[PDB]
Amino acid sequence: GLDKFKKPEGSWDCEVCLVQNKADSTKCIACESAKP
């Protein structure tokens, strides 16, 4: 299965464009929207 899938610790998904962002980023690397 995909049972062994995990995201990087503290990463977050942009609510505007769905890009995954790093834990320490405060804004989306793609669309520049603020972290939810």
Binding site: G1, L2, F5, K6, K7, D13, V16, C17, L18, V19, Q20, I29, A30, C31, E32, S33
Partner: protein, 202 residues
């Protein structure tokens, strides 16, 4: 936590990119508009034998007609589809430019080349001429957005590359908008034959 990939869908204006992405009904009902970049992101779920995967497909708002796309469009792309229109040789002639722009920002992400509108009888870019993919490690498919012909093929190939599982399968097709035009079965069979011969011939 969902497995998802950002997929950029690029190619000349008028090639059918919007028509193609819109075939996936839930991806259309759940699409997200990104005002800062002029993009509609369509979240396309496919159910594999190892679970669901989501391709978040970035569809432009037409800006490719007027110039290159901004860096934000390409940022963090994990895969791509380059589209052209098999009734317009100009759109195939521009495929190397799209590939260049992709690799410049995204390096060696997996890319699929799609020749759209194969439902149209007066086809101009035929299998024997479609060679860009051979020299660049690209996979090629004929597609017809309006008839759903081969809709799933680019996504399955990308999913296999991204996961690293050559045996990955889709256990069911996504719910797609009903075909708007007929893809003639004899025509499809002939085009399928022409591609096979092109891929195997010495």
């Amino acid at each position: 936590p969902q497995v998802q990939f950002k997929l950029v869908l690029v190619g000349d204006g008028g090639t059918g990119k919007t028509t193609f992405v819109k075939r996936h009904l839930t991806g259309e009902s759940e699409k997200k508009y990104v005002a800062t970049l002029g993009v509609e992101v369509h979240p396309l779920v496919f159910h594999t034998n190892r679970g669901p995967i989501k391709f978040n497909v970035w569809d432009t708002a037409g800006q490719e007609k007027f110039g290159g796309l901004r860096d934000g469009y390409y940022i963090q792309a994990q895969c791509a589809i380059i589209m052209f229109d098999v009734t317009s040789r100009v759109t195939y002639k521009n495929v190397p430019n799209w590939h260049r722009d992709l690799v410049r920002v995204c390096e060696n992400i997996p890319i699929v080349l799609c020749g759209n509108k194969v439902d149209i009888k007066d086809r101009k870019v035929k299998a024997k001429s479609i060679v860009f993919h051979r020299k660049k490690n690209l996979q090629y498919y004929d597609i017809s957005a309006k008839s759903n012909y081969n809709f799933e093929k680019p996504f399955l190939w990308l999913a296999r590359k991204l996961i690293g599982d050559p045996n990955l399968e889709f256990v069911a097709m996504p719910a797609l908008a009903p075909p708007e035009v007929v893809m003639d079965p004899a025509l499809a069979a002939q085009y399928e034959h022409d591609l096979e011969v092109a891929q195997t011939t010495a």
